[PDB]
């Protein structure tokens, strides 16, 4: 399940990229809260993962 970006270049539509979505819009918090994401790691909400967030075959 891909999505079109909310914020995108004009040339996104001109080259017809919406026929091949690449990523998903996600709500991203710039927060030091977890302690499990310091160098480059990131934390994914477990509920979102159970709801099909970033799923592929």
């Amino acid at each position: 399940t891909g999505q079109t970006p909310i914020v995108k270049a004009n040339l996104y539509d001109d080259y017809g990229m919406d026929n091949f979505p690449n990523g998903f819009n996600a709500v991203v918090a710039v927060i030091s809260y977890t302690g499990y994401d310091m160098d480059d790691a990131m934390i994914i909400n477990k509920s979102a993962d159970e709801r099909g967030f970033g799923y592929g075959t």
């Binding site: 970006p5 914020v7 819009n25 991203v28 918090a29 310091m38 592929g56």
Partner: protein
């Protein structure tokens, strides 16, 4: 990753109740450490999160072609005015509360929507574990390759680091005791590794290890036969040491060069 080279592996899947929640009830699906930015310096991700939140609110889309904003028409001012005119904070911050204890966090959290891409380097193609299994042909050492059930390599630099610790039993355990440990038979007299052979046992008699370099032909109870039946007497002064198998293969390759190695057994 985002569209700003902000890659990073998913560390843990945080439970939703443990995730911080905002005043509007939403819990982010991605948490990115604030320390990623000061060195990478991808301010584009900040302004994109601002604009994505504003666009998701107003139900619009904002172009992000470079060089539309200049030193006067700042994107921060633009998308901040858009954010304020929907009730949210001009700087994109949101009062959030800790979902672990319950209390409100010290400062306003910076939230927004950013476009996230899932890269193809999944971790099911990376891990491998081997205890025992298939071994190489002539060295009797683990095979190469994750998909063939092979061991991993303790190389030259690993060996040098394992010596520098003074860890010698550890170095022997990795390089020898768990790679190609073999209890071969040597000639206590002639000092050769693979010149010996098992005597073909006979009815009644018991098989023994016997030399084929220190054995003289019976035609030229200390006798033994071969598989071809050509029996002859030879020195039974043969021993059992602990050596790698690659030593035996190297001794073969040295015989192919006409070069003999004499291994002296310490107890004679």
């Amino acid at each position: 990753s985002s569209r700003h080279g902000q890659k990073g592996v998913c560390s843990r899947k945080w439970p939703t109740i443990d995730m911080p929640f905002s005043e509007t009830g939403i819990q982010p699906d991605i948490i990115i450490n604030p320390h990623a930015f000061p060195s990478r310096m991808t301010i584009g991700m900040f302004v994109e999160s601002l604009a994505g939140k504003a666009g998701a609110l107003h139900g619009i889309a904002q172009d992000s072609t470079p060089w539309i904003f200049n030193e006067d028409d700042t994107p921060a001012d633009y998308f901040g005015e858009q954010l304020a005119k929907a009730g949210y904070n001009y700087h994109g911050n949101e009062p959030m509360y800790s979902g672990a204890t319950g209390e409100e966090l010290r400062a306003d959290i910076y939230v927004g929507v950013v476009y996230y891409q899932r890269l193809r380097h999944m971790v099911n193609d990376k891990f491998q574990v081997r205890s025992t299994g298939p071994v190489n042909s002539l060295t009797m050492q683990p095979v190469k390759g994750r998909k063939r059930h092979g061991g991993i390599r303790v190389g030259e630099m690993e060996r040098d680091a394992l010596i520098g610790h003074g860890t010698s039993f550890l170095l022997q355990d990795r390089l020898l005791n768990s790679s190609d440990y073999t209890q071969a038979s040597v000639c206590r007299e002639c000092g050769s590794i693979l010149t010996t052979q098992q005597s073909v046992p006979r009815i009644g008699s018991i098989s023994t290890v016997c030399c084929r370099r220190c054995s003289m032909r019976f035609e030229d109870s200390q006798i033994w036969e071969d598989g071809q039946g050509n029996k002859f007497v030879g020195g039974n002064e043969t021993t059992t040491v602990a050596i790698p198998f690659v030593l035996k293969y190297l001794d073969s390759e040295l015989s192919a060069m006409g070069i003999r190695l004499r291994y002296n057994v310490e107890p004679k």
